[PDB]
Amino acid sequence: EGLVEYIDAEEEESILIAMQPEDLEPAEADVDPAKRIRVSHHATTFTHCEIHPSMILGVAASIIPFPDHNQSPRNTYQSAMGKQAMGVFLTNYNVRMDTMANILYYPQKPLGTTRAMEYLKFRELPAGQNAIVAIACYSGY
Amino acid sequence: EEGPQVKIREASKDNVDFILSNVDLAMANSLRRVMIAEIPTLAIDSVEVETNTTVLADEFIAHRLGLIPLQSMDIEQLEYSRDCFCEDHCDKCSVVLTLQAFGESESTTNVYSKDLVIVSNLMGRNIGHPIIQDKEGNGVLICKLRKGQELKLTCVAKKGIAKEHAKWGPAAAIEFEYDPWNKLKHTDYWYEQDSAKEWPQSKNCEYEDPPNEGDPFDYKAQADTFYMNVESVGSIPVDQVVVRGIDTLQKKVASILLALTQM
Amino acid sequence: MIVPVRCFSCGKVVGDKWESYLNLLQEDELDEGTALSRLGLKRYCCRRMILTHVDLIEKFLRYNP
Amino acid sequence: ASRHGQKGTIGITYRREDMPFTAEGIVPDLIINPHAIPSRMTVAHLIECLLSKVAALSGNEGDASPFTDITVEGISKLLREHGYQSRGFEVMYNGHTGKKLMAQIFFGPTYYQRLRHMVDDKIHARARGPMQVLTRQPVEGRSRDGGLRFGEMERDCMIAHGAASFLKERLMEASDAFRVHICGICGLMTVIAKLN
Amino acid sequence: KAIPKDQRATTPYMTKYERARILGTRALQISMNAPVFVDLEGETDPLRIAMKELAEKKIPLVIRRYLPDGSFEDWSVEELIVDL
Amino acid sequence: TLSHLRRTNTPIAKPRQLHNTHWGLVCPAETPEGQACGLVKNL
Amino acid sequence: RGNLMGKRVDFSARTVISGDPNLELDQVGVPKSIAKTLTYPEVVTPYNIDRLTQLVRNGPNEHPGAKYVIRDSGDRIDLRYSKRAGDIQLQYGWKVERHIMDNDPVLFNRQPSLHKMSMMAHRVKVIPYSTFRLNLSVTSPYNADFDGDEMNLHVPQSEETRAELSQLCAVPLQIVSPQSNKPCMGIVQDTLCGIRKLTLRDTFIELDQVLNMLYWVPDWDGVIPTPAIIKPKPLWSGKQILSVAIPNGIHLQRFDEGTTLLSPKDNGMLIIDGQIIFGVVEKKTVGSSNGGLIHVVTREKGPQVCAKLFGNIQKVVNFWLLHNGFSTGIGDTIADGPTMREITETIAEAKKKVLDVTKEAQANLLTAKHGMTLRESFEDNVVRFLNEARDKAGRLAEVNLKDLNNVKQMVMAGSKGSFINIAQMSACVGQQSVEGKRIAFGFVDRTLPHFSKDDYSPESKGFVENSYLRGLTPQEFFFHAMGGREGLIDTAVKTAETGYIQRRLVKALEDIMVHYDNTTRNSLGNVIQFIYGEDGMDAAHIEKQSLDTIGGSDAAFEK
Amino acid sequence: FDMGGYFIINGSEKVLIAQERSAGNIVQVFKKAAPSPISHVAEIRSALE
Amino acid sequence: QNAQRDAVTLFCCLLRSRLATRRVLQEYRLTKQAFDWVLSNIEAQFLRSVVHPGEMVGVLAAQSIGEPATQMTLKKVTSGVPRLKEILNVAKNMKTPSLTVY
Amino acid sequence: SNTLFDDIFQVSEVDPGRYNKVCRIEAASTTQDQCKLTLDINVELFPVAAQDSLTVTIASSLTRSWRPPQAGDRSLADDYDYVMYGTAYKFEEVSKDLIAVYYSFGGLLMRLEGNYRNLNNLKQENAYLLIRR
Amino acid sequence: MNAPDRFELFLLGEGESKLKIDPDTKAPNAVVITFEKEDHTLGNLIRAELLNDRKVLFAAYKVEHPFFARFKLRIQTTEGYDPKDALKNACNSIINKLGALKTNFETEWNLQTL
Amino acid sequence: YDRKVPSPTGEYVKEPEWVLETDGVNLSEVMTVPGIDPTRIYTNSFIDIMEVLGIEAGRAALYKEVYNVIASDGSYVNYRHMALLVDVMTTQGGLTSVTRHGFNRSNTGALMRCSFEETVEILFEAGASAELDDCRGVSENVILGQMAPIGTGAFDVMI
RNA sequence: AUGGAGAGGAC
Ligand SMILES: [Mg+2]
Ligand SMILES: [Zn+2]
Numbered sequence A: 001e002g003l004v005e006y007i008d009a010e011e012e013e014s015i016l017i018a019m020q021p022e023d024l025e026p027a028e029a030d031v032d033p034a035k036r037i038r039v040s041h042h043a044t045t046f047t048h049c050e051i052h053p054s055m056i057l058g059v060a061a062s063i064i065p066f067p068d069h070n071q072s073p074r075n076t077y078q079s080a081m082g083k084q085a086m087g088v089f090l091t092n093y094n095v096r097m098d099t100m101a102n103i104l105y106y107p108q109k110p111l112g113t114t115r116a117m118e119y120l121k122f123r124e125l126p127a128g129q130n131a132i133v134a135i136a137c138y139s140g141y
Numbered sequence B: 001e002e003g004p005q006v007k008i009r010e011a012s013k014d015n016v017d018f019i020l021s022n023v024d025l026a027m028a029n030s031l032r033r034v035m036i037a038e039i040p041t042l043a044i045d046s047v048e049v050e051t052n053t054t055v056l057a058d059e060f061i062a063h064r065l066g067l068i069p070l071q072s073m074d075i076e077q078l079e080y081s082r083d084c085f086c087e088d089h090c091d092k093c094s095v096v097l098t099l100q101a102f103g104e105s106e107s108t109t110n111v112y113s114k115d116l117v118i119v120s121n122l123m124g125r126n127i128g129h130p131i132i133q134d135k136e137g138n139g140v141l142i143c144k145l146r147k148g149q150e151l152k153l154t155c156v157a158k159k160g161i162a163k164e165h166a167k168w169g170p171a172a173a174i175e176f177e178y179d180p181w182n183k184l185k186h187t188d189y190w191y192e193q194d195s196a197k198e199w200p201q202s203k204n205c206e207y208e209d210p211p212n213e214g215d216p217f218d219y220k221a222q223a224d225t226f227y228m229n230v231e232s233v234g235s236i237p238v239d240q241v242v243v244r245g246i247d248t249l250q251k252k253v254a255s256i257l258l259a260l261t262q263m
Numbered sequence C: 001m002i003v004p005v006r007c008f009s010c011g012k013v014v015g016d017k018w019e020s021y022l023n024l025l026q027e028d029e030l031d032e033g034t035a036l037s038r039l040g041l042k043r044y045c046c047r048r049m050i051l052t053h054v055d056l057i058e059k060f061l062r063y064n065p
Numbered sequence D: 001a002s003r004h005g006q007k008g009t010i011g012i013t014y015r016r017e018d019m020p021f022t023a024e025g026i027v028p029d030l031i032i033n034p035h036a037i038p039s040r041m042t043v044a045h046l047i048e049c050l051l052s053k054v055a056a057l058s059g060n061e062g063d064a065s066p067f068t069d070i071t072v073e074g075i076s077k078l079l080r081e082h083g084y085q086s087r088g089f090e091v092m093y094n095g096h097t098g099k100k101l102m103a104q105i106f107f108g109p110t111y112y113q114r115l116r117h118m119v120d121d122k123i124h125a126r127a128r129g130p131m132q133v134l135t136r137q138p139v140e141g142r143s144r145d146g147g148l149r150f151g152e153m154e155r156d157c158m159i160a161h162g163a164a165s166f167l168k169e170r171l172m173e174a175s176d177a178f179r180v181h182i183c184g185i186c187g188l189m190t191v192i193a194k195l196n
Numbered sequence E: 001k002a003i004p005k006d007q008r009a010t011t012p013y014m015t016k017y018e019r020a021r022i023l024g025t026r027a028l029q030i031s032m033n034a035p036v037f038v039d040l041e042g043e044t045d046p047l048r049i050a051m052k053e054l055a056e057k058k059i060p061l062v063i064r065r066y067l068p069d070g071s072f073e074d075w076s077v078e079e080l081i082v083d084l
Numbered sequence F: 001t002l003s004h005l006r007r008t009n010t011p012i013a014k015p016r017q018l019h020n021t022h023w024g025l026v027c028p029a030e031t032p033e034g035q036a037c038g039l040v041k042n043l
Numbered sequence G: 001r002g003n004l005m006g007k008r009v010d011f012s013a014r015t016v017i018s019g020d021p022n023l024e025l026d027q028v029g030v031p032k033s034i035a036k037t038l039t040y041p042e043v044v045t046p047y048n049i050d051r052l053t054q055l056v057r058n059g060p061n062e063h064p065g066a067k068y069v070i071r072d073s074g075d076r077i078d079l080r081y082s083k084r085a086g087d088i089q090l091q092y093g094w095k096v097e098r099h100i101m102d103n104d105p106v107l108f109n110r111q112p113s114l115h116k117m118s119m120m121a122h123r124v125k126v127i128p129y130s131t132f133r134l135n136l137s138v139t140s141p142y143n144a145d146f147d148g149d150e151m152n153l154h155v156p157q158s159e160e161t162r163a164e165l166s167q168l169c170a171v172p173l174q175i176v177s178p179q180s181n182k183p184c185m186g187i188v189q190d191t192l193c194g195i196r197k198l199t200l201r202d203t204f205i206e207l208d209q210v211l212n213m214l215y216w217v218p219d220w221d222g223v224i225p226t227p228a229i230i231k232p233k234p235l236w237s238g239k240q241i242l243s244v245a246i247p248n249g250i251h252l253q254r255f256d257e258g259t260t261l262l263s264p265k266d267n268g269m270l271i272i273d274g275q276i277i278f279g280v281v282e283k284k285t286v287g288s289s290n291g292g293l294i295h296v297v298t299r300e301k302g303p304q305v306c307a308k309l310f311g312n313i314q315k316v317v318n319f320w321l322l323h324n325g326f327s328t329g330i331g332d333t334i335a336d337g338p339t340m341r342e343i344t345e346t347i348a349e350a351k352k353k354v355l356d357v358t359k360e361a362q363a364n365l366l367t368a369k370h371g372m373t374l375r376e377s378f379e380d381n382v383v384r385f386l387n388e389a390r391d392k393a394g395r396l397a398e399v400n401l402k403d404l405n406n407v408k409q410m411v412m413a414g415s416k417g418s419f420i421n422i423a424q425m426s427a428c429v430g431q432q433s434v435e436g437k438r439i440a441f442g443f444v445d446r447t448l449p450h451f452s453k454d455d456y457s458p459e460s461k462g463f464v465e466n467s468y469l470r471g472l473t474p475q476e477f478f479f480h481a482m483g484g485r486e487g488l489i490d491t492a493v494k495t496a497e498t499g500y501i502q503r504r505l506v507k508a509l510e511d512i513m514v515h516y517d518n519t520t521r522n523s524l525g526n527v528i529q530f531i532y533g534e535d536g537m538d539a540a541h542i543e544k545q546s547l548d549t550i551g552g553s554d555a556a557f558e559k
Numbered sequence H: 001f002d003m004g005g006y007f008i009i010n011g012s013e014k015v016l017i018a019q020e021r022s023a024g025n026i027v028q029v030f031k032k033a034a035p036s037p038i039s040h041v042a043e044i045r046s047a048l049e
Numbered sequence I: 001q002n003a004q005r006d007a008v009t010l011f012c013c014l015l016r017s018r019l020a021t022r023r024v025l026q027e028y029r030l031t032k033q034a035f036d037w038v039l040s041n042i043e044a045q046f047l048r049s050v051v052h053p054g055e056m057v058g059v060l061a062a063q064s065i066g067e068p069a070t071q072m073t074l075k076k077v078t079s080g081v082p083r084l085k086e087i088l089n090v091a092k093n094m095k096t097p098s099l100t101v102y
Numbered sequence J: 001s002n003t004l005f006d007d008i009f010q011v012s013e014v015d016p017g018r019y020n021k022v023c024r025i026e027a028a029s030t031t032q033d034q035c036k037l038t039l040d041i042n043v044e045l046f047p048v049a050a051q052d053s054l055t056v057t058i059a060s061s062l063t064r065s066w067r068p069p070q071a072g073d074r075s076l077a078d079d080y081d082y083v084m085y086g087t088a089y090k091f092e093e094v095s096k097d098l099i100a101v102y103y104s105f106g107g108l109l110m111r112l113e114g115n116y117r118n119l120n121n122l123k124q125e126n127a128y129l130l131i132r133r
Numbered sequence K: 001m002n003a004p005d006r007f008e009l010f011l012l013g014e015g016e017s018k019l020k021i022d023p024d025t026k027a028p029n030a031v032v033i034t035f036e037k038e039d040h041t042l043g044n045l046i047r048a049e050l051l052n053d054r055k056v057l058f059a060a061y062k063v064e065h066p067f068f069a070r071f072k073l074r075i076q077t078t079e080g081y082d083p084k085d086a087l088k089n090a091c092n093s094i095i096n097k098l099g100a101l102k103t104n105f106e107t108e109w110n111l112q113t114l
Numbered sequence L: 001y002d003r004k005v006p007s008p009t010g011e012y013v014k015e016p017e018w019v020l021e022t023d024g025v026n027l028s029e030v031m032t033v034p035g036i037d038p039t040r041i042y043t044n045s046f047i048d049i050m051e052v053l054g055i056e057a058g059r060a061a062l063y064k065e066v067y068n069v070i071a072s073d074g075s076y077v078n079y080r081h082m083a084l085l086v087d088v089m090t091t092q093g094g095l096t097s098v099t100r101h102g103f104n105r106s107n108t109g110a111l112m113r114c115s116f117e118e119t120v121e122i123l124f125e126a127g128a129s130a131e132l133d134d135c136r137g138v139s140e141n142v143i144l145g146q147m148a149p150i151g152t153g154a155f156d157v158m159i
Numbered sequence M: 001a002u003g004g005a006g007a008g009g010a011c
């Protein structure tokens, strides 16, 4: 029905993309001091609009909560490390016979999530638990 | 009576909420750890499996059985296996319970600590009955079995101490709090603009007088008066937690007194 | 992979509260926070024990053998 | 590891008693060091922990989606309605002692993952074992029960210290010491030592 | 040749590598119950002995220092100053 | 598994660098460290 | 290279490593399982025979024990099997291969092994659990931490080889290293944080806790020092008790910025004999630094007593801290109301200034800085306007964090963090850059396809106007991701080039030693230096001192 | 939850890994060195697939 | 004997300036018995500070330049590791050749 | 055992220089024109207003480890409001006719300046400064 | 795998005695009692108590490494009062407060509802 | 550039000067220019310094540049080490780099050079030139499994 | 056993 289009890097070169459906194009207008600073519309000669900025990340990074408040290299380090996090790898582990299978006893859908986790089935097949954790100098161990 | 003082503000089957006047901070705390970790209890500490054609793995189930709160009231007349002169276990030092469940129904069949069955000889003691606080009278969900599945095992519950495994804690959480408006400056509060408006007042601020800007700091003050609340998990009724708590602390303070004499 | 027989951190029995928590959610419509409260799951550590829980065993039973 | 590149391994385990405790009886499953926070600017961690706490109390599901109008201030108001101090902190008590902690501690649920890389799969030790045939040196690998390389770089270290008998011993009585017979004329190992 | 006892050029002091090696060497002799030359005062450790034997100048070994060219001077452990 | 099924490899002037045109096709964060950094990419 | 210059070897072990506030400096915690495998031959001798026959009775798998007794013939009685593990008379002269034990010297190592300090002799302490354990202060020469690093351990097999270790290689005798003529180990993290905490002029300790701390230092003479305060209630001062850890005749004096023998800011440092007179104790003193405590104590009282010093300073500080506590939260990334509005209006006056230049440069009234493009001048001016923006906005946020601010308390102690860490967490993260320039046009004339062509303005080109606290936007995210990948690459690439530089330097200097004539030579007896280092000295025994014949008026010199 | 996309070869599950190359049949110009004679080059990889 | 007087110059320069008469008596009023110690020390402490023949002083230099080269990572000149790759390579065409004129 | 200096002072400056327990205090003797004092007081134990007027003394007296006290049962040598135990670390001629001594009471510092003073303050291990009222 | 059994926290080993009493060499009339199989639960409670006894010049305890359930009490007393008595008394005192704390709690409890 | 220099009265004072900085190097000819101080001129190219003002000033400037790398980076390595390297490059007579080109040329025993870079070609014409080997090289004794003449091994022990 | 590949740990 021509509401969505597929664009490769070469055609991406010829179009102007809005980043957020609403915000980025109703007409023309106070604020919240907590909210990160944005820019605007400017240039209003769009051809296309982002489906959703959080879609620029792939699978492993899609797990990181608030990645947009982390120094990049960390988001990378957690990407290497999310892949080596025990939990249920498939529901049928009892009937497989793999060399090496690690299954976490009591998996737990994380308390802070990501809209993208939805499509990654992270909440159904989690790998990690929710430890009540404390930042403190204690015994020094 | 004479020394250290108790006032109970609230009391249930599961929670005693008290105030403890006229005591050292050392005693008030030491009592709290004893309650957490040194009052003896009964828990499954050995499971012999005979079938488990269940979705869950043998030692995983064994593990859950350990955590299941078993009646430990008359516990002081059960012995420690390690002490008792039998080989392995006996009726003097262990309660044995049995489990069988087979899924018969199309609908998923459950297995509850209700379904556990004392089989050794209790001989009068009030011990080993799995605790059930559940509304429909089936406490804890050991596991589920589908139509064909079967689980057939045998537990030996033994006398144990939270120090050795947290399964033996009569425990649950123990709230603890003194000097509710820092009249002792035992903390120093973190603030952005206002200590007082940003930290919230504890419930126990109805029980003490506020300090008045118009005053200078009381440097003689010591911590008295400690607002506790002990929650029991059931293997012992709350009153007994705090009493066996005090009983044990005294017991192992005693052995020190005794040991001076021996040596 | 079945309700924890016991909240980790603190020790409260939360094993018997699963069944019932499902009923508060679905059968009389309540919302998770409310449903948790009625179970006496008051301090937030035993309060995550249940809300974060995932019952994989309901998937595990699906396999025949 | 939390979910923000804060790896770290265990150093000790303390029981509930010895652990520091919230006034309501709560005790942590886990203590990380505040020194892991400032150099690594890993603020998501700090937010997920605070977000995570309201979710738990409120029974909702904290949304930490990337580009959203969810805000450390707005989480803090929510946490404040829940009766707790709006920035994470809670007064806590040392467990050895019952005495208040002077400082207040940032306390909260935070998703933590357990990684492969547990010690009893790394732990290895060898006091002589099996050798390769070609070099008559030790075999490689813990799975084969082998020795560890004394690398050129470690050889330099011993040279620098000036520990010569040790650099010798490491390269003879460990590893591949061997006795041969030389001709005092031509100088090769040509000799046919019909020893004995 | 050799190189004469008057006109030795090198430190009268004992280098740390000399020490280490003397103590090492005596501890190796002692460990094999070759005879012990001082008053072992409880001290049962072969190396901890050699240290006491050295602090008492009763170690009868001699140090042959090679100069780069092949010359060399002998000093006795008896005569070297042990500061350090 | 999910990650591994969606991987990229590049053999052998500035290839490891995250290039503007990666926007929205390749993940800006998920790549390995060392060795393979910027050459192994994830969709 | 891989078989002669470097062999795989016997008597070795590897595991995970973790830290231990209660090991001595020069100790190494060795798992009882590893302890049980690695061996040392001991000759049988009237001095050890009772301990040795006894270790054989234990046999090969009950800790202090042994496997293998070796005979006259030199045959191999194997104590795990062998019908006569139970018998066994021990003729003088048979070796017994006993387990490793407490105070055996072993050689400890973390790779890559970049300096002599990367392999050191520790004293074994056999302990439960499967990690090795070291003091935190032996952390840096190893360049270790406990996020999963692993370390090796090599056990010496002869009497002289353990001699060589405890006499040449021992951790104490490495504290002050020739590399930089300074200590290479100091007080770090918790201890360094809390020692500054302990010494504030506000930090007073009262009796109970004073006698506990006092008891914790084991060299303690059993003499309570007289409290600074007696008056209404005997208080002691943080400074006071910590001074129990510090030896006698240790003199040290400093002077920082304010400092004036009244140190109105508790600045600097004065330690008149083993007692600290004035000043907050932090990194400049107790860190691994040039003029500091650890330098002085080592030189002044001997490595032994200094090695022991680390121990004492931690046992006390670590204790005091366990009972003070300390922590960080998002609390300390929040700058003020008012401070936020300034940060925003600073940033904006930089945005509105880069505009003016871009306006002017386009209009053709910008002049070239001598010898460079018009366009080069523009970029240079813009990156300065935006770097100073980020600094001014940072420094503005640093001024508003209180003394009770945890991030700010770590900075002061010197335990972690720095201005830029504060800057980027609270104020503004700043300009993303790749290859020395701000973000390029990857597409024709734009940077992402959400911009129009030919747009050089802050945001378009990589300015992350936001803080980590407030959070990066989509564009900003990607950009900051670009800049980070550059750093990840040439961190992976740095270690490769350096790993080589090194190998060459070493292989090229390999055989240069100092011969018995103080001449510096090599395998050819070729002269490199006539007197080593020009002065004949060893770099460990050298300290910065001022030659004050050299400055000042001709008048004040004669005076 | 298994997603497919892989093969199974002698029991073992394999994933083919996407391989990156330059496009063929595309014309690119490249400035070249300065210790060089050939100063610009326009080049084309000619693919038929 | 000249190499010896050379080697020791810079240290004496210091010694002579610290142990000069006005100063000994005036700044830090030493007594005869204390002074004789202050000498006795200096000579011992000095002797202790001589480098020990045996010191593989080569390896020690490579590592001492090598190691901090490894803590190097990031407007004119080529600096850091790439500069150090050049210096040790006696690179014929360095990336930033430059004159400094006075 | 004995007194080593006495005088009455009038406070002229309180300073909570970013502390909440200590205060650098400035004062002048109400007798001697050639005389000032600066001192670190624990203002949370013995609170001090400006324009206060404190009696100040140095004893040396009424070392064996500090036995916990029983003082109106012992010899309190005080009946003063506020009493510290410090060390002397420098003796500085402001020249003339003008001598100042420096004291550290575990880091709470004090600098006193006068002239006849000297003839009584030895270079010593000493000094319990006492205050009252 | 290298973990020590948990019971070694509270059972005594091969001829471990419960207390060891040693003459402290540093100062006179002072003793260092080692308590095998205890921790803060006890060592803090005795320290705190020894400090109310006014013929006690010094009392402090310390758990030297936490892998191990063992602490040390160092005690010093006024000449004429042997250290052990100082502890002996200190223990009974504790027991009596606890004996009181017990009955005082009961009579309170026997008065409640729910 | 700022500059410290003795004052008319003794005290070192800040007395700043105008300095000139170049893209590119021609030392041979810029020093011969009128108007400047040919006594104090510098290039980072130490390879020209060596050509123009000879080997000793080359050494001095090769160090100046090595030092400047460590220092620019914040760090400080003691002078004796950087001197030793610099002196080792500098004693053959010209600049002798740290590669198979530089140091690994120099008639030091064959086994020693063979342990770096060009293993076999070194050992080949070591066979065809029929070389003798000292065996004083640390790394030859590594190979032979003997005690290196290295601290501890630098002398001998006797009776 | 040998020989090769790939993933991954620490800087
Ligand atoms: Mg690491
Ligand atoms: Zn029995």
Ligand SMILES: [Zn+2]
Residues within 6 Å of the ligand: C007, C008, C009, C010, C011, C012, C043, C044, C045, C046, C047
């Ligand atoms: Zn809980």
Ligand SMILES: [Zn+2]
Residues within 6 Å of the ligand: D183, D184, D185, D186, D187, D188, D190
């Ligand atoms: Zn022959």
